[PDB]
Amino acid sequence: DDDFLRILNGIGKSDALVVKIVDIFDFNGSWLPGLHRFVGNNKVLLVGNKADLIPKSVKHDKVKHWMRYSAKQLGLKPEDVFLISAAKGQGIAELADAIEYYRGGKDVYVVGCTNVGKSTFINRMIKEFSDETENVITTSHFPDLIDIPLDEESSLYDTPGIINHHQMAHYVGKQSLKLITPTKEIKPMVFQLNEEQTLFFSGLARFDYVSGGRRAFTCHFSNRLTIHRTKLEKADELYKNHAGDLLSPPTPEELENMPELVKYEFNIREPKTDVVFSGLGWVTVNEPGAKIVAHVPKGVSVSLRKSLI
Ligand SMILES: Nc1nc2c(ncn2[C@H]2C[C@H](O)[C@@H](COP(=O)(O)OP(=O)(O)O)O2)c(=O)[nH]1
């Protein structure tokens, strides 16, 4: 896309600070691939939004470490990493302080995938900087987006939200998306499963515990998401007949316009390990030796990380 390339090069040519917002519950789904090569000369702040949804047991220091590590794997080395709740306000004041410090008197560009919370964050920034300057907000066209004065000589620029065609939220509608997203702090639900058992996180993803005897699994998902538990040999049959009805989301219409569910295998060899379904939630495995087969639509990310508790 010619449009997005032009702005990336423009931002790269400037000495501006880049603020990249990601959804902490959809880290890989909301990642902007390639951004790192265009803003290599620029200082970047990586901002993880929706911190209010993080369970109390999860440590923010470990979340930031995981964000920093994950960004590094994908070629981005941010100056620093921040956790915020644009909705509730947590971390906003500190981030505003950091933006002022790191920008070094230059402009700032805010970038993000759709639904990460960029509009909500931009609203927080307008408030944070409102009492600071005599210049007023202006709108400007992409070759109306907001330009927020930081002082009389520099501004913070909102940029058009990017559509990631492969993230989970791209395959669901408004009514459907409401069920998958947590409205409040995620409450960790403790499961005790035997070998050859299956968990369906609605009709969008599957978790197969294929080998390792009897174990405990802590699931972290939206309270509006329905988790269906079956025997492994019954899982295939249930999905072929009840997806779109019982195993919904997705709806029958969304099922037809969605990539086919693809499998991935994992073998955990260390204690406290999360199976992370981007855009959905995560399953914690306290003990090593578990053999797991995760199912996710073609394109959507599922990965492993060390627990953040
Ligand atoms: N729980 C939680 N939800 C949030 C937060 N910030 C934004 N949201 C919600 C509000 C919207 O329903 C949805 C998308 O927000 P938005 O600001 O319109 O995102 P964007 O498409 O402009 O990137 O996410 C936040 O900090 N916490």
End-to-end Cα distance, the chain: 40
- Give which of 97, 151, 111 is closest to 12, Cα–Cα: 111
Q: Which atom of ligand 1 is nearest to the CA of 184?
A: 1
Q: CA 306 to CA 287: how far, in whole Å? A: 12
3-state secondary structure of 285: strand
Phi, psi of 102 (to 5 degrees): -70, -25
**Helices of type H across 74-156:** 92-103, 118-129
Q: CA 187 to CA 192: how far, in whole Å? A: 16
Q: Are 174 and 182 in contact (CB under 8 A)?
A: no
Spacing, Cα 49 to ligand 1 middle (Å): 8
Resolution in Å, one decimal place: 1.8
Residues with CB under 6 A from ligand 1: 49-50, 52-53, 85-87, 112, 114-120, 161
Q: CA 297 to CA 180: how far, in whole Å? A: 15
Do 173 and 162 belong to one domain? no
Helices and strands (DSSP H and E) totals, the chain: 8, 17
**Helices of type H across the chain:** 2-13, 35-38, 60-73, 92-103, 118-129, 174-180, 232-242, 252-256
Which of 103, 132, 166 is at the close of a domain?
166
Range of the domain at 151: 1-166
* Token pair belonging to 289: 């030796």
Do 157 and 179 belong to one domain? no
Which of 151, 166, 181 is at the close of a domain?
166
Which of 131, 166, 201 is at the close of a domain?
166
Binding residues for dGDP: 49, 52, 86-87, 115-120
Do 244 and 149 belong to one domain? no
